[PDB]
């Protein structure tokens, strides 16, 4: 019985800019329960149909999990284009695997702020599929030095999410995983 | 070739209200002599990164020009609200090119102060993108034909005194 429980029932999920990748092998897993589970809001994937997953013996399984806002969730799919997709997590067009997302707004919000899950904005020079690069530094066009923030001149690339308001269908703190075969 | 030196090295600059326009085309202009110069305090470009304009060809560009304060430069932007973004030359919310400015206190100085400069400060309503109004008349609720009679134009009281020094603004829009 392969242990997907801790992957799907962990405590502290990694930030989007530094998503944690887990290795799964030498185990037998059942996909009947995952598709039969209605507690997960979104379960749609291709490359292999979900109903036929009970008869496969592929080599390696990757468990990637991170946290994204309820908006731009569809940007996780490959061949897309967006603020987060093209910049912090890009999937190749030759991708095979599935994407799973569920709401977890029961233990993140309705408090004096969350301030846990950072991200970088529309900057840098785009992304390639599967890099996981963290080079936090201050840079901006305009023939500038590197001394500090100085907005009239430079910016600090990363800022925070906000899920304090109870409002927002696409603003609730959703959690997402992407299994790759 | 397009002679940018005519507008960037002219002798006199029109006031903000009656700003002299220009339209240049059918020539070759390089966007490096002005970009690399260190005399420009501010050089902000919208919709295009400055060093790739040479690889782009357009139908026609424009060269607006006027004179404003130093601390009043920032109203020249897509959609603020002040004394120039509502009552004088006002940018639209659409595409805009590269807005330039620099300090020009060298040739605008001395005890008298260049009172020839003037600006509009008594407009009765908002403007349209690139309005360029030309008129002069009082406004008041007195129903008096030919006059209480405050002039609708004031004079920039310039003098060699950090947000009041003369600046030169030239806008490239295409």
């Amino acid at each position: 019985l392969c242990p997907f429980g801790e992957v799907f029932n962990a405590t502290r999920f990694a930030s989007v800019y530094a998503w944690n990748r887990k290795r799964i092998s030498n185990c037998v897993a059942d996909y009947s329960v995952l598709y039969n589970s209605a507690s997960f809001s979104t379960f749609k994937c291709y490359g292999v149909s979900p109903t036929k997953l009970n008869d496969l013996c592929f080599t390696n399984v990757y468990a990637d999990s991170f946290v994204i806002r309820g908006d731009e969730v569809r940007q996780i799919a490959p061949g897309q284009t967006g603020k987060i997709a093209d910049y912090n997590y890009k999937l190749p067009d030759d991708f095979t695997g599935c994407v799973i997302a569920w709401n977890s707004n029961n233990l993140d919000s309705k408090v004096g702020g969350n301030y846990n899950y950072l991200y970088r904005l529309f900057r840098k020079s785009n992304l390639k599929p599967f890099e996981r690069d963290i080079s936090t530094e201050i840079y901006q066009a305009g023939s500038t030095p590197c001394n500090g923030v100085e907005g009239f001149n430079c910016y600090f690339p990363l800022q925070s999410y906000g899920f304090q308001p109870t409002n927002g269908v696409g603003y609730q703190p959703y959690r997402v995983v992407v299994l790759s075969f | 070739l397009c002679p940018f030196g005519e507008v960037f090295n002219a002798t006199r600059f029109a006031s903000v209200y009656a700003w002299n326009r220009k339209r240049i085309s059918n020539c070759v202009a390089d966007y490096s002599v002005l970009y690399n110069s260190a005399s420009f305090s501010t050089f902000k470009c919208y919709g295009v990164s400055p060093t790739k304009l040479n690889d782009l060809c357009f139908t026609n560009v424009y060269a607006d020009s006027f004179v404003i304060r130093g601390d009043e430069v920032r109203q020249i932007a897509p959609g603020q609200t002040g004394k120039i973004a509502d009552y004088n030359y006002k940018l639209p919310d659409d595409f805009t090119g590269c807005v330039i400015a620099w300090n020009s206190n060298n040739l605008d100085s001395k005890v008298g102060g260049n009172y020839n400069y003037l600006y509009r400060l008594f407009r009765k309503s908002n403007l349209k993108p690139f309005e360029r109004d030309i008129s002069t008349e009082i406004y008041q609720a007195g129903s008096t034909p030919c006059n209480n009679c405050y002039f609708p134009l004031q004079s920039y009281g310039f003098q060699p005194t950090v947000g009041y020094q003369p600046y030169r603004v030239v806008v490239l829009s295409f």
Partner: antibody, heavy 120, light 113 residues
Framework: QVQLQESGPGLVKPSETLSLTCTVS????????WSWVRQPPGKGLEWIGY???????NYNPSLKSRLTISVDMSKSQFSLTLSSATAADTAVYYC??????????????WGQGTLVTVSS | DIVMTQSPLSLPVTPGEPASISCRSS???????????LAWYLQKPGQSPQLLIY???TRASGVPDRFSGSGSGTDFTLKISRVEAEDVGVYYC?????????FGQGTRLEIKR
């Protein structure tokens, strides 16, 4: 230097027009937006709206149905008229000089303050 | 509307050491310019509010040069290098990107003795 000052009645009956006047002294006519602001007792501050010298103005959407503001160049005074008020509007009113006109909002100068009460 | 938040709500500080007050926004505060608009007022007991910082990085006329701010986007921070006997009051932070402009709850600074 500019020294603002208010004046007006202190007690007003419910559902009755409220009138005040923030006289300006010293620095006369100029290209500066003027605003109004109030404060519920023991709470935060609430900005209302701003008026230009000519007369153009923008209003807070919450109070855009029963409030008016004008100006008078000759007397260097501008007034605030609020009608059909309730008891919730009992507060202290300050008149500013810079105006938070969605551009910079430099509140360079503030008034002394006047308290108004709604009761019968 | 966009709502301002501060942290903490009360702060006791002994004279001599630096302090800090944080005001976090709910929406990105950066107009089409490179500027980010913000303000920091100071209301002493029994008086009217005064201006200390505007544009989050430029002081006002006559203000002692001990106050300063930094940050961009949705995070800003004000610091007082050396507090004094006259720094008793309630501090507010204003956003002015678009109508309406609303303040925060108001940090209360406490002096120790």
């Amino acid at each position: 230097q500019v020294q603002l000052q208010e004046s007006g009645p202190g007690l007003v009956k419910p559902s009755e027009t409220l009138s005040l006047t923030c006289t300006v002294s010293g620095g006369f006519i100029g290209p500066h937006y003027w605003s109004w602001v109030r404060q519920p007792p023991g709470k935060g501050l609430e900005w209302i709206g701003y008026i230009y010298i000519s007369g153009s103005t923008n209003y807070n959407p919450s109070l855009k149905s029963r409030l008016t503001i004008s100006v008078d160049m000759s007397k260097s005074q501008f007034s605030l008229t609020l009608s059909s008020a309730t008891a919730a509007d009992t507060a202290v009113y300050y008149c500013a000089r810079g105006g938070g006109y969605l551009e910079t909002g430099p509140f360079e100068y503030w008034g002394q303050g006047t308290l108004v009460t709604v009761s019968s | 509307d966009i709502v301002m938040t501060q942290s903490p709500l009360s702060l006791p500080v002994t004279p001599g050491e630096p302090a800090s007050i944080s005001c976090r926004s709910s929406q990105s505060l950066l107009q089409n310019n490179g500027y980010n608009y913000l303000a920091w007022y100071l209301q002493k007991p029994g008086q009217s509010p005064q201006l200390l910082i505007y544009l989050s990085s430029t002081r006002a006329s006559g203000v002692p040069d001990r106050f300063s701010g930094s940050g961009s986007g949705t995070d800003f921070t004000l610091k007082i290098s050396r507090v004094e006997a006259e720094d008793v009051g309630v501090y507010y932070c204003m956003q002015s990107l678009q109508i309406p402009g609303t303040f925060g709850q108001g940090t209360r600074l406490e002096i120790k003795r």
